[PDB]
Amino acid sequence: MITMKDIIKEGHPTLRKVAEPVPLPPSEEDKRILQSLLDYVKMSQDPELAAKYGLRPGIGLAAPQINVSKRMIAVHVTDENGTLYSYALFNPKIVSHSVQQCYLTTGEGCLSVDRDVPGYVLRYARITVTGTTLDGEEVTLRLKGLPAIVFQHEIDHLNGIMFYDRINPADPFQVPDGAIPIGR
């Protein structure tokens, strides 16, 4: 049961480290931690539960954000067609992606970053991710759009990368030729 007081903030060294892979089959404690990421993402999205326990809504979360330097991520997001993508994975990795990029026109926010950081965060429009689930299933997920963006954001945390690292340092709102802007 993670709450905002368990979330570390930008500046904490753990957020810039490369997380350690998780030995499989997982220990009961590593399963507990991964499950806890997924439960926080789901719960943070019920505004009543968020207010009750002091959570901030997130559509994804990575172990390093609660100061656990291990390769674990959770994702719970609905795409533009109304389809839910809910996952809790050990050792996720993007094995291939599109050359074409996309980005949210609103920019991105991070639970560990307490301040408006303006600008487009460039992401691949399509990706393929492998990982192992809480029940030992090895999955290969072909994702696009917002779900693909969320996976890139959480996997980035496991490599010590923050979203603003992918914002153009010269003109944050540079419009990339051919890139898909996402935002209605």
Residues that bind ligand BB2 (CB under 6 A): 58-62, 65, 104, 106, 108-111, 149-150, 153-154, 157
Q: So which residues are the catalytic ones? A: 154
Interacting stretch for Ni ion, rule CB under 5 A, among 29-37, 71-79, 106-114, 131-139?
Answer: 106-114
Give CA–CA dist 164/144, Å, rounded. Answer: 21
Q: Which is nearer to ligand BB2, 70 or 157 (CB)?
A: 157
Q: Which is nearer to Ni ion, 41 or 110 (CB)?
A: 110
| Nearest in space to 100 (alpha carbons), one of 154, 165, 171, 180 | 180
Q: Which residues are annotated as a binding site?
A: 110, 153, 157
Q: Which residues are annotated as a binding site for Fe cation?
A: 110, 153, 157
CB of 128 to ligand BB2, least distance (A): 18
CB of 54 to ligand BB2, least distance (A): 15
Q: Which is nearer to ligand BB2, 28 or 116 (CB)?
A: 116
**Residue 110 near Ni ion by CB under 5 A:** yes
Beta bridge partners of 130: 93, 140
104 binds, among ligand BB2, Ni ion, none (CB under 5 to 8 A by kind): ligand BB2
Write the DSSP string, the chain: ---GGG---TT-GGGGSPPBPPPSSPPHHHHHHHHHHHHHHHHHTSHHHHHHHT----SEEEGGGGT--BSEEEEEEE-TTS-EEEEEEEEEEEEEE-SSEEEETT----TT--S---S-B-EESEEEEEEE-TTS-EEEEEEEHHHHHHHHHHHHHHTT--GGGGB-SS-TT---TT-EEE--
**49-68 mask for Ni ion (x: CB under 5 A)?**
--------------------
CB of 50 to Ni ion, least distance (A): 16
Q: Which is nearer to Ni ion, 55 or 110 (CB)?
A: 110
Interacting residue ranges for Ni ion, rule: CB under 5 A: 110
